[PDB]
UniProtKB/Swiss-Prot annotation, chain A:
Glycans are attached at N66, N313. It comes from the Viruses. Changing N95K: In strain: Omicron/BA.1. Changing Q193H: In strain: Omicron/BA.1, Omicron/BA.2, Omicron/BA.2.12.1, Omicron/BA.2.75, Omicron/BA.4, Omicron/BA.5, Omicron/BQ.1.1, Omicron/XBB.1.5, Omicron/EG.5.1. Residues 188-232 form a coiled coil. The record marks R80, S81 as: Cleavage. Changing T266I: In strain: Gamma/P.1. This is Spike protein S2. Residues 159-209 are annotated as: Heptad repeat 1. Precursor of the fusion protein processed in the biosynthesis of the S protein and the formation of virus particle. Mediates fusion of the virion and cellular membranes by functioning as a class I viral fusion protein. Contains two viral fusion peptides that are unmasked after cleavage. The S2/S2' cleavage occurs during virus entry at the cell membrane by host TMPRSS2 or during endocytosis by host CSTL. It comes from Severe acute respiratory syndrome coronavirus 2 (2019-nCoV). Disulfide bonds join C3-C25, C8-C14, C271-C282. Changing N208K: In strain: Omicron/BA.1, Omicron/BA.2, Omicron/BA.2.12.1, Omicron/BA.2.75, Omicron/BA.4, Omicron/BA.5, Omicron/BQ.1.1, Omicron/XBB.1.5, Omicron/EG.5.1.
Length: 315, 45, 115, 243, 146
């Protein structure tokens, strides 16, 4: 925001009479710079976990695992997954105020997420702490199954049925995400909150702030001294206390947003880069895989679970 | 002038070169003024 | 109504040098060395084919640095080198040697008290 | 663009002994782009004026000897008219029979009765008094005066301010002029305890100085900063209002 | 160990986190001290001359503007110091968690303490801070096989 002209209405009078107050909007701008730099620091922290870019081989022979629904589409002009495009499609300043563009853009965000997906699918968890080593997908799955506490031969003796189940599950989750209209609640809430905040901030100007008149251009240099100072100082109390609550509801909002970001970063580092033993951390049930996706101002996860379903009485 | 109070007088060492009238400090207050009538530096805190 | 915007300054350290460039925010150069960009008007910067990572961030997906000696130039963001591996039904990699590393970490604990 | 009484031209607004502290003051000072040539009368006489000299070189004099002039080349205004006995002076807007051409021989108070020794002067007519400042060092070369960083230290004075004519710091002992190009803005000072200090700094030589004054510091660190918002120039109002 | 001694002796950019909070508190104190000297429209700022010459019709508004300006500025002293306390308390919680988990045992968490496979950890003291050293294991040389 532009403090001096916003609060004085570009008045030379206001100018040479308001120098009594001091550095108020200077530290206001200090706080605004602080929150602005915090935003980009958070974004870089969450999405800067990988040092080298990788790429998948062009031949798609992965033993039945049709990862097309999550892989980027080279044919389309934008190299994004079909579910990413579905998310992007379902998801849909003048009197001294400004809006800044983000430092990072969707193109390199998509590049980062695609590189992460390719690296993890190609080399399992090996690349998380050293040089990537190639290893077959069924052998990686056997390692995961031995990790959970089941003998490996079970996977071999049922791999076809397991692949069929996995393909069916991927199709069904695609159907569920296409059908689900209530998933975007938090992001919609944040956007609507910001919109309403700025709306009431701008609409504040039209009020008198208790003024015994309303014409802005004519009176306030028909008669400056005690009707100016009072109108503009109840205007500045109104303005800098709605911005006291503006800045500070924005900082507590950024505090909860940064707690969310910290938990998201931990989720990345544990569930996505490897396999976690903590119960009911990376979703409910048993945790095997992890697939991240991109969203406007948000991130989307995917999980793979193992569940038993047919017991029998025994002695 | 116009300063009075109860306390222990303190010595001074502040120097003073070619152009003064009265002592003034940084803090927009008065802390140490050289004696106007004796031309001797005197700092009281 | 007419627009407005902040005037931004990009500079290296004082002991390093004293040459300085200027950045205009949100303005269009057609409506005001010249380097027309999406962000605005730049002086001393050029579309340079070689790229580096971000050193002094400016915004809008572009970063500038004291570069060719060193001068205030603008370059597009660079992430890192590409790589790929050979995956086959009968391929495997195995390590043979190791090493030891040491890293550090810093965290704040408290702050002073006043009255 | 610097050719000196050096970054003197910062006179001392009062005797308040600020010491080793930052403070920027807005006062009456002098603008940019002061250039001049050398001519004939069909190499620096009286300058474009205010009280002394400009901003970068070195010297030490023992030169000046004589005078018959007015400081504004008028002598109706405050001349360098020495009927001033060095303890009592006369300065005459005091209306006497003026000769349009001066001469030389073989009420207007100082006691109170009718300069590379860089003693600044006083004809700042805030309700009519008279006085002098004082500092010292000389001219044997192109321009000079010396370096430091702050105003000096207070002992005895009676200050009201200056109106003489040749922008300052002055020229004396221990054709047309030439001066340089100086930007007027606030002036930061640092009065060390021992008092070995002369200089200041300006704010709008360039965006470098803009940051220097905006951050209220000197050692500008590597980075990016934003100064005062540049309002896009509204040369004229808008044709939208009725009649 | 030798190389980490040399690296810490050489690079001076580590202490920025602590320097940030130190400068933040110093700046806040300087601002609140400075704000006193203003007049807020009053004819004078020295109370003695105030009550000697100009009464409190406008010294009551000068004390009103003083108390309200210190309401914002000291409620914000405690308010940004309070959000700072929230941040430092989250930091202390995280520090204690790291203490207990990665110093009193061995963590299986991925990249929770350093990069690689953690083996050892030793804490070191800092003014209003703490220092950790992580010793990890990294594979070096690889070969192809079938």
């Amino acid at each position: 925001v532009d403090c001096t002209m916003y609060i004085c209405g570009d008045s030379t009078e206001c100018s040479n009479l308001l120098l009594q107050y001091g550095s108020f909007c200077t530290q206001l701008n200090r706080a605004l710079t602080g929150i602005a730099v915090e935003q980009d620091k958070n974004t870089q922290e969450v999405f800067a976990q990988v040092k080298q870019i990788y790429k998948t081989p062009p031949i798609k022979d992965f033993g039945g695992f049709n990862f097309s629904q999550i892989l980027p589409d080279p044919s389309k002009p934008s190299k994004r997954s079909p579910i990413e495009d579905l998310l992007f499609n379902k998801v849909t300043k003048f009197n001294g105020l400004t809006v800044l563009p983000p430092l990072l853009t969707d193109e390199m965000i998509a590049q980062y997420t695609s590189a992460l997906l390719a690296g993890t699918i190609t080399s399992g968890w090996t690349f998380g702490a050293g040089p990537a080593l190639q290893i077959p997908f069924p052998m990686q799955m056997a390692y995961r199954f031995n990790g959970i506490g089941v003998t490996q031969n079970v996977l071999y003796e049922n791999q076809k049925l397991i692949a069929n189940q996995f393909n069916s599950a991927i199709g069904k989750i695609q159907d569920s995400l296409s059908s689900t209209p209530s998933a975007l609640g938090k992001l919609q809430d944040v956007v609507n909150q910001n919109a309403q905040a700025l709306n009431t901030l701008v609409k504040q100007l039209s009020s008198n702030f208790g003024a015994i008149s309303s014409v802005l251009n004519d009176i306030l240099s028909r008669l400056d001294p005690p009707e100016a100072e009072v109108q503009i100082d109840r205007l500045i109390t109104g303005r800098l206390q709605s911005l006291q609550t503006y800045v500070t509801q924005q900082l507590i909002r950024a505090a909860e947003i940064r707690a969310s970001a910290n938990l998201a970063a931990t989720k990345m580092s544990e569930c996505v880069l490897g396999q976690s033993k903590r119960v009911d951390f990376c979703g409910k049930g048993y945790h095997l895989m992890s697939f991240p996706q991109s969203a406007p101002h948000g991130v989307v996860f995917l999980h793979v679970t193992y569940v038993p379903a047919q017991e029998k009485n025994f002695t | 002038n116009g300063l009075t109070g109860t306390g222990v007088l303190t010595e001074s060492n502040k120097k003073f070169l070619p152009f003064q009238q009265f002592g003034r400090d940084i803090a927009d207050t008065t802390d140490a003024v050289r004696d106007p009538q004796t031309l001797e530096i005197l700092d009281i805190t | 109504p007419c627009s407005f915007g902040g005037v931004s300054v990009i500079t290296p350290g004082t002991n390093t040098s004293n040459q300085v460039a200027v950045l205009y925010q949100g303005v269009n150069c057609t409506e005001v060395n010249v380097f027309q960009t999406r962000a605005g008007c730049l002086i001393g910067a050029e579309h340079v084919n070689n790229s580096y990572e971000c050193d002094i961030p400016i915004g809008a997906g572009i970063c500038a640095s004291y570069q060719t000696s060193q001068s205030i130039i603008a370059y597009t963001m660079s992430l890192g080198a590409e790589n790929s591996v050979a995956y086959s039904n009968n391929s495997i990699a195995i390590p043979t040697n190791f090493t030891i590393s040491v890293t550090t970490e810093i965290l704040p604990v408290s702050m002073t008290k006043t009255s | 663009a610097y050719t000196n009484s050096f970054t003197r031209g910062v006179y001392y607004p009062d005797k308040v002994f600020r010491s080793s502290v930052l403070h920027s003051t807005q006062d009456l000072f002098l603008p940019f782009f002061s250039n001049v040539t050398w001519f004939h009368a069909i190499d620096n006489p009286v300058l474009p004026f205010n009280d002394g000299v400009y901003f970068a070189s070195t010297e030490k004099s023992n030169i000046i000897r004589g005078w018959i002039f007015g400081t504004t080349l008028d002598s109706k205004t405050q001349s360098l008219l020495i009927v001033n006995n060095a303890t009592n002076v006369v300065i005459k807007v005091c209306e006497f029979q003026f000769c349009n051409d001066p001469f030389l021989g073989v009420n207007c108070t100082f006691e109170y009765v009718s300069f590379k020794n860089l003693r600044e002067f006083v004809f700042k007519n805030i309700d009519g008094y008279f006085k002098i400042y004082s500092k010292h060092t000389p001219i044997n070369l192109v321009r000079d005066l010396p370096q430091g960083f702050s105003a000096l230290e207070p002992l005895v004075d009676l200050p009201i301010g200056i109106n003489i004519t040749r922008f300052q710091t002055l020229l004396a002992l221990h054709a047309a002029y030439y001066v340089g190009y100086l930007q007027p803005r606030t002036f930061l000072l640092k009065y060390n305890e021992n008092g070995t200090i002369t200089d200041a700094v300006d704010c709008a030589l360039d965006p470098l100085s803009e940051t220097k004054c905006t951050l209220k510091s000197f050692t500008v660190e590597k980075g990016i900063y934003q100064t005062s918002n540049f309002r896009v120039q509204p040369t004229e109002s808008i044709v939208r209002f009725p009649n």
